[PDB]
Paper text:
Mediator of ERBB2-driven cell motility 1 (MEMO1) is an evolutionary conserved protein implicated in many biological processes; however, its primary molecular function remains unknown. MEMO1 is a highly conserved protein found in the cytosol of eukaryotic cells from yeast to humans. We conclude that MEMO1 is an iron-binding protein that modulates iron homeostasis in cancer cells. Our work reveals that the iron coordination mode in MEMO1 is very similar to that of iron-containing extradiol dioxygenases, which also display a similar structural fold.
Residue numbers in the entry: 4 to 297
The structure:
């Protein structure tokens, strides 16, 4: 059997040289002042680092490496038809900084729930939405590099009921302060290439309309309300890539609220790959945010 998932997008989605990538991540993180430590969950983009790395630093700076010991990474599936969630078949996720080990105890528990399928190595390596969080996770945790594990989870095209079921499942881990949930998503993909041209002309320029649409969704997430987030998706069909991981996170949050826990979510940075001004333009939006639980 193969023990390691290769960093199959190193060199094309981020720098393949370990030292250079470490330096890039350090610069981005050094631009950010921590305000939401110790983050129990984060939302972070999964585009190429040239496009979204400085944005993603706003989420990853909120991780406290002396507290966090187990990092779940929930990323949407881009290439395979998947109606549930899937777990990796390997034991180690390689990165150019250092290699990350999967938490065997949690993987066994998750598998024993019976709600997960096993993703093949090819499916595992083909997807990028989890991989793009490995370098940043490795960088954020480096002061404790030998004392943490990861729990990779591929999230498919979940129904609403599956979002609720998986939220309930993951809530027991979300309530543990040693755990961190990384929820991978980009926001609005606007343009004819994405077959998405929603435009609110009360907002002015197209990029301002995109910013307004994205921030309506972001505010709804800050309301910790999965039903309202679902209604927002049904109303505008915003091209939020990781809407299913986000729905899982929101349902998990509502499970913890029904158990006495107090929580708050704040988005800390918003960016667009470019500023659309005409109908032939296209852009992708990135947003970084953090959930703290007391
Ligand atoms: N270099 C990689 C990544 C390129 C990239 O990051 N593109 C931007 C669009 S400007 C992006 O946001 N991709 C992820 C997405 O569309 O959600 C590739 O060739 O696909
Ligand atoms: Fe995407």
């Amino acid at each position: 059997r193969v023990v390691c998932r290769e960093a199959s997008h190193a060199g094309s989605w981020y720098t393949a040289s370990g030292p250079q990538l470490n330096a890039q991540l350090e610069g981005w993180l050094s631009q950010v002042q921590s305000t939401k430590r110790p983050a129990r969950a984060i939302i972070a983009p999964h585009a190429g680092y040239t496009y979204c790395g400085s944005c993603a630093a706003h989420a990853y700076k909120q991780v406290d490496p002396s507290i966090t010991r187990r990092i779940f990474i929930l990323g949407p599936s881009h290439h395979v038809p998947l109606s549930r969630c899937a777990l990796s078949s390997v034991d180690i996720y390689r990165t150019p900084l250092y290699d990350l080990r999967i938490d065997q105890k949690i993987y066994g528990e998750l598998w024993k729930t019976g709600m997960f399928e096993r993703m093949s190595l090819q499916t595992d390596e083909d997807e990028h939405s989890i991989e793009m969080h490995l370098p940043y996770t490795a960088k954020a945790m480096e002061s404790h590099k030998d004392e943490f594990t990861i729990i990779p989870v591929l999230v498919g095209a979940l129904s609403e009921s599956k979002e609720q079921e998986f939220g309930k499942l993951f809530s027991k881990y979300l309530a543990d302060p040693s755990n961190l949930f990384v929820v991978s998503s980009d926001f609005c993909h606007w343009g004819q290439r994405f077959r998405y041209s929603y435009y609110d002309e009360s907002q002015g320029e197209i990029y301002r309309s995109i910013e307004h649409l994205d921030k309506m969704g972001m505010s709804i997430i800050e309301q910790l309300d999965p039903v309202s987030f679902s209604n927002y998706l049904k109303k505008y069909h915003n091209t939020i890539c990781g809407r299913h991981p986000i729905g899982v996170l929101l349902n998990a949050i509502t499970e913890l609220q029904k158990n006495g826990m107090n929580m708050s979510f704040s988005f800390l940075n918003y960016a667009q790959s470019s500023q659309c001004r005409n109908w032939q333009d296209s852009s992708v939006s990135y947003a970084a945010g953090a959930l703290t639980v007391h």
